[PDB]
Design a protein around this nucleic acid. Structure first.
Ligand code: NA
Length: 289
DNA sequence: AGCGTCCAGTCTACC
DNA sequence: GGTAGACCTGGACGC
């Protein structure tokens, strides 16, 4: 991917954008803190920063950032180095994916912070999206740090060190319910250095899975979500109840467990399974039933 | 109406 | 070895 990057005032401008749509990316099920503004831009809090991203054709405008932050954080965050055009061409050899892709041509897989992804998907278990977003914003407001953009105060996602001094019931005030003890355990294990998130990428995918699943409340799905959305292992296929029913309806024509859905997809899609999953998901939400 | 009821991954207890 | 049932919260749903 070749871009023309320029720093103009309080913003960074990227020209040569392809295979990118903000709505499709931000509503693909991968993330929770990006919110649409009246002009169609999206304001989000990630990596202790607040930025506004706007896309005008092939021109991305990131407000409230500099060249240093763009190259250090946002380039990788929006996975800009990857050719999704090639990915879609390869996947479109499957008629099912080709159809799904036409509705989500601009989906990119964000490379998000490991800790935030971990807690976010802990929150996500047995939960609906609107509620997950409210709980995550509650965690940030209650426990995070204030940062300001255009006169409005935004809150960073709380680090393990910013959570450990609170009891479960204090954490539970975020409306996370029975998941409070899971957040508590995750914070404790990371804070003590028992689970090292920085060195996690040095391990195999199976090893990462096992490390993460030591946390009370982290099972196969949460672990796989961290692995895909934060570590960037694309030969994975996180199986939720939706993708199970989607694959059942469109491929298998019979019922199956989340596990058998999973190995079928990884076999068929290989190193592009994670991308295939995103396309199928936004397509499933587009169709409804 | 204004109530009942169903329910959107992981753990636990128990096979 | 494997899994039925419970589970905070809270909108949708039937009558
Ligand atoms: Na666990």
């Amino acid at each position: 991917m070749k871009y023309n990057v320029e720093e103009k005032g309080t913003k960074v401008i990227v020209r040569g954008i392809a295979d990118f749509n903000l709505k499709e990316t931000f509503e693909s099920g991968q993330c929770f803190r990006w919110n649409e503004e009246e002009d169609g831009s999206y304001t989000g809090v990630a990596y202790d920063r607040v930025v506004n991203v706007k896309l005008e054709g092939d021109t991305l405008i990131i407000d409230n950032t500099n060249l240093t932050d763009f190259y250090d954080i946002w380039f990788d965050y929006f996975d800009l180095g990857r050719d999704y055009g090639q990915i879609k061409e390869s996947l479109s050899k499957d008629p099912v994916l080709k159809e799904a892709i036409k509705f989500g041509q601009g989906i990119r897989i964000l490379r998000q912070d490991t800790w935030e992804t971990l807690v976010s998907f802990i929150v996500s278990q047995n939960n609906r999206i609107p509620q997950i977003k409210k709980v995550i914003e509650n965690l940030a407001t209650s426990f995070g740090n204030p940062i300001e953009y255009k006169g409005k105060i935004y809150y960073t996602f709380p680090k393990p060190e910013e959570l450990v001094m609170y009891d479960v019931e204090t954490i539970a005030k975020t409306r996370c319910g029975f998941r409070a003890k899971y957040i508590f355990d995750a914070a404790s294990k990371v804070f003590s250095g028992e689970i090292n998130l920085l060195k996690l990428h040095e391990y195999s995918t199976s090893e990462i899975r096992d490390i993460l699943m030591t946390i009370n409340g982290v099972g196969p799905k949460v672990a796989d979500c961290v692995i895909l959305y934060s570590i960037g292992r694309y030969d994975t296929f996180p199986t939720d109840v939706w993708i199970k029913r989607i694959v059942e309806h469109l491929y298998l024509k019979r019922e199956g467990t989340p596990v058998e859905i999973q190995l079928f997809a990884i076999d068929k899609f290989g190193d592009l399974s994670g991308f295939a999953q995103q396309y199928l998901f936004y397509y499933g939400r587009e169709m409804g039933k």
